[PDB]
Amino acid sequence: ANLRTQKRLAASVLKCGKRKVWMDPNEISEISNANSRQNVRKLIKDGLVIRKPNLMHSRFRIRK
Amino acid sequence: QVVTRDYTIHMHKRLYGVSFKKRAPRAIKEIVAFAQKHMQTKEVRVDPSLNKEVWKRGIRNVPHRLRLRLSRKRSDEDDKALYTYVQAVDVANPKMETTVVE
Amino acid sequence: VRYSASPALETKCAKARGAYLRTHFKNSREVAFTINGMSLKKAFIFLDNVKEHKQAVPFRRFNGGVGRTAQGKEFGVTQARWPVKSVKFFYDLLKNAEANAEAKGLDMDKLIIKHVQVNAAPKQRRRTYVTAYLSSPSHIEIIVAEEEETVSRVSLKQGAKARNLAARK
RNA sequence: GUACGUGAAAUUGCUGAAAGGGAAGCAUUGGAAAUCAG
RNA sequence: GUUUGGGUAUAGGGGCGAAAGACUAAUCGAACCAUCUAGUAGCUGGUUC
RNA sequence: GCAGAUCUUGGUGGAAGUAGCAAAUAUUCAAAUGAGAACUUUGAAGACUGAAGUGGGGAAAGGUUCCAUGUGAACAGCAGUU
RNA sequence: GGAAGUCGGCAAAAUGGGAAUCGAUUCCCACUGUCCCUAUCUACUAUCUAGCGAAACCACAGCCUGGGGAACGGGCCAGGCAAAAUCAGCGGGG
RNA sequence: UGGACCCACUAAUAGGGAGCUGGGUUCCUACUGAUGAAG
RNA sequence: AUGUGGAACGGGGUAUUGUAAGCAGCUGCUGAGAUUAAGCCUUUGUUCCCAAGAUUUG
RNA sequence: AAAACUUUCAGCAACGGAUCUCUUGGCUCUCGCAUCGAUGAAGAACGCAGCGAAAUGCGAUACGUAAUGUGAAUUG
């Protein structure tokens, strides 16, 4: 369905950016039903929504 | 009716001179048209893996020849309607001849 | 409601109407003029083909700036187009007309489009930054019906000669 | 049938009739078709 | 390779201006608004069977 | 008693489906919803703003535009399930 | 080849610079599609398509030659002529 | 004809009719291409 | 519309560049490697597809 | 030399809102009367109904209370 509010809440509870919020593609029904932040934290614990890790500035070649 | 074949497409000749900002989108359009004219179908679905393979080098660079696996699978909405599913094949040297996959 | 034509009688006809449609009146007229007189099944094939860009609607009257094409050679003209919105509306009314015909109890095989017409609708005002971008909606109605296909005197001289000729015969 | 009394003109669509080689309109006479009348 | 926010003051042949005869709410042949005003017409254009 | 007054008010035309549509590089594949998907949502891929941001906040100003649910009559020079 | 173009090195290339006269001018050197003399390449527009969709202007219109005392004009006179519907250009005629 | 009346070339550099810039005063129709129904 | 039929690839020739990665020991493989019709030529190569749909015609 | 196109005519359908009829309105004339406010006026604001946004009425006693008259409603 539509998951704008779910993504916004997911970023709010994960304390990260909504670009880094990863929302499972083949559990859309359950994610859509999860509407409040308590349900969103439930999805976080079950692993349906995962916070993507950060990227890197590669100091490796910066040192090189 | 339901068949699967490994084709090779000469992408070098299907986008000779095309604009650099349209290479990847026209590549997808040529792939689906290639599948249509081979399997004699209408609905053709592009595997996201093959889309990744097309856009690996950027929107302006596409490999000259690509190995494709065209499967004329039966549709899941109408048992009399049939579609083609195109997925990329990872081969060492793309210059091989067309074959039939079991 | 009364239509533009004497038919729509219960003997052979079926009715369909669409009012205040967001479709261009000029394109709607072209589609109506093209499909007029066609068989119902032939019209469905034609409209499907226009949707799929295999045949085209000739633009007879409102042909200013319309490009030329090969697909118009089946109607003896060069300016043809593929107005998809008008085709969608006409297809819906034709489907409704067929459904009304089935409800009335007519023979679906002999049904042809006897009377199709497009009329202008009250224009809709929208602003342009000043001037207007007036819309031109269309009133379209369709009538489909199954196809179905001397007391001179004689003067005294004239008849007397005719009687004399008969006597000679 | 609320976009609702009556519902004109400009303008538009359909049908029928007719005309059309760089104008169209109008007038006079008459034919042709249609129509009415004594 | 002084600028500027807010507060306040200056009001119409006035104010303001390093002065362009410039700005003063997209208007400065002379701000805008309403009355006198239905202003003044040797003039122009229309004036109906 | 109107044919005019660059007349007043209202309505309607030909031009004409014509001129034209916006700057701001760029979108593609699959799936879901849905009557309907180039434009909605998710994933994957490719890009951009590149800390003097297409970032996060405020003052003036606006005033409910905020959030949820539903709709797709009218508005979003295409479309729309937004 | 090197300003031969143009009122003239306008604009680019030399990286702009050397000497004289009063920043300007001149001179010599230098550079180059300004030119001989144009050719080629790319993007956008224009083209077609789906959707949306105007305005100015509008007595009516739309071929030319000679004449119509003028103002010759498109209507009038005498001629050449004259065949549907259209598309993309260029702008002569308003 | 090429260059700043001038000096060259040239066989010759003859005379006239019916888009642009400098110093000087203080829609339709035409033209060109492209289709196109029809005895 | 079953044919010296067409198409997609493949080989060869012809061209462009310049001797690849790797294996190695500048040298050898290596005038190699990459590209080659997108408006190049050829094909006893393989695979695939066509004896179909619509419209107008005395 | 048929269609299409353009134009003219007629029927129908559109567009538009003219005409005809109406009218709890306006305009004009005549007659009668003299009555605002610090005991808070005119005006403005904000509220008040079971379901009301505007109009009207009213003011926390709020689409009103008291008193008098009518006599059986209000109305979606």
Swiss-Prot record, chain A:
Gene Ontology CC annotations of this record: cytosol; cytosolic large ribosomal subunit; preribosome
A biological process from GO: cytoplasmic translation
Other remarks in the entry: There are 2 genes for eL19 in S.pombe.
Function: Component of the ribosome, a large ribonucleoprotein complex responsible for the synthesis of proteins in the cell. The small ribosomal subunit (SSU) binds messenger RNAs (mRNAs) and translates the encoded message by selecting cognate aminoacyl-transfer RNA (tRNA) molecules. The large subunit (LSU) contains the ribosomal catalytic site termed the peptidyl transferase center (PTC), which catalyzes the formation of peptide bonds, thereby polymerizing the amino acids delivered by tRNAs into a polypeptide chain.
Localization annotation: Cytoplasm
Major site of localization recorded for this protein: cytoplasm
UniProt-recorded Gene Ontology molecular function terms: RNA binding; structural constituent of ribosome
Family recorded in the similarity comment: Belongs to the eukaryotic ribosomal protein eL19 family.
Subunit structure: Component of the large ribosomal subunit (LSU). Mature yeast ribosomes consist of a small (40S) and a large (60S) subunit. The 40S small subunit contains 1 molecule of ribosomal RNA (18S rRNA) and at least 33 different proteins. The large 60S subunit contains 3 rRNA molecules (25S, 5.8S and 5S rRNA) and at least 46 different proteins. eL19 lies in close proximity to the binding site for eukaryotic initiation factor eIF4G.
Full-protein interval shown: 2 to 65 of 193
Keyword Oxidoreductase: no
Keywords: Cytoplasm, Ribonucleoprotein, Ribosomal protein
Species in which this protein is naturally found: Schizosaccharomyces pombe (strain 972 / ATCC 24843)
Higher taxonomy: Eukaryota, Fungi, Dikarya, Ascomycota, Taphrinomycotina
Protein name: Large ribosomal subunit protein eL19A
Domain of life: Eukaryota
Curated annotation (Swiss-Prot), chain B:
GO molecular function, one term: structural constituent of ribosome
GO biological process, any: cytoplasmic translation
Entries under Gene3D superfamilies matching the protein: 3.10.440.10
Keyword list, A-Z: Cytoplasm, Ribonucleoprotein, Ribosomal protein
Chief localization: cytoplasm
Origin superkingdom: Eukaryota
Any Pfam family: Ribosomal_L31e
Cellular component GO terms held in the UniProt record: cytosol; cytosolic large ribosomal subunit; preribosome
UniProt cross-references to InterPro entries, sorted A to Z: Ribosomal_eL31 (IPR000054), Ribosomal_eL31_CS (IPR020052), Ribosomal_eL31_dom_sf (IPR023621)
Localization terms from the record: Cytoplasm
Keyword presence, Hydrolase: no
PANTHER family per UniProt: 60S RIBOSOMAL PROTEIN L31
Family: Belongs to the eukaryotic ribosomal protein eL31 family.
Its biological purpose: Component of the ribosome, a large ribonucleoprotein complex responsible for the synthesis of proteins in the cell. The small ribosomal subunit (SSU) binds messenger RNAs (mRNAs) and translates the encoded message by selecting cognate aminoacyl-transfer RNA (tRNA) molecules. The large subunit (LSU) contains the ribosomal catalytic site termed the peptidyl transferase center (PTC), which catalyzes the formation of peptide bonds, thereby polymerizing the amino acids delivered by tRNAs into a polypeptide chain.
Subunit structure: Component of the large ribosomal subunit (LSU). Mature yeast ribosomes consist of a small (40S) and a large (60S) subunit. The 40S small subunit contains 1 molecule of ribosomal RNA (18S rRNA) and at least 33 different proteins. The large 60S subunit contains 3 rRNA molecules (25S, 5.8S and 5S rRNA) and at least 46 different proteins.
Name of the protein in question: Large ribosomal subunit protein eL31
Protein's organism: Schizosaccharomyces pombe (strain 972 / ATCC 24843) (Fission yeast)
Classification of source organism: Eukaryota, Fungi, Dikarya, Ascomycota, Taphrinomycotina
UniProtKB/Swiss-Prot annotation, chain C:
Gene Ontology CC: one annotated term: cytosolic large ribosomal subunit
Subcellular location: Cytoplasm
Protein origin, superkingdom: Eukaryota
Cross-referenced Gene3D superfamilies: Ribosomal protein L22/L17
Keyword Ribosomal protein: yes
Function as written in the Swiss-Prot or TrEMBL entry: Component of the ribosome, a large ribonucleoprotein complex responsible for the synthesis of proteins in the cell. The small ribosomal subunit (SSU) binds messenger RNAs (mRNAs) and translates the encoded message by selecting cognate aminoacyl-transfer RNA (tRNA) molecules. The large subunit (LSU) contains the ribosomal catalytic site termed the peptidyl transferase center (PTC), which catalyzes the formation of peptide bonds, thereby polymerizing the amino acids delivered by tRNAs into a polypeptide chain.
Protein name as catalogued: Large ribosomal subunit protein uL22A
The organism of origin for this protein: Schizosaccharomyces pombe (strain 972 / ATCC 24843)
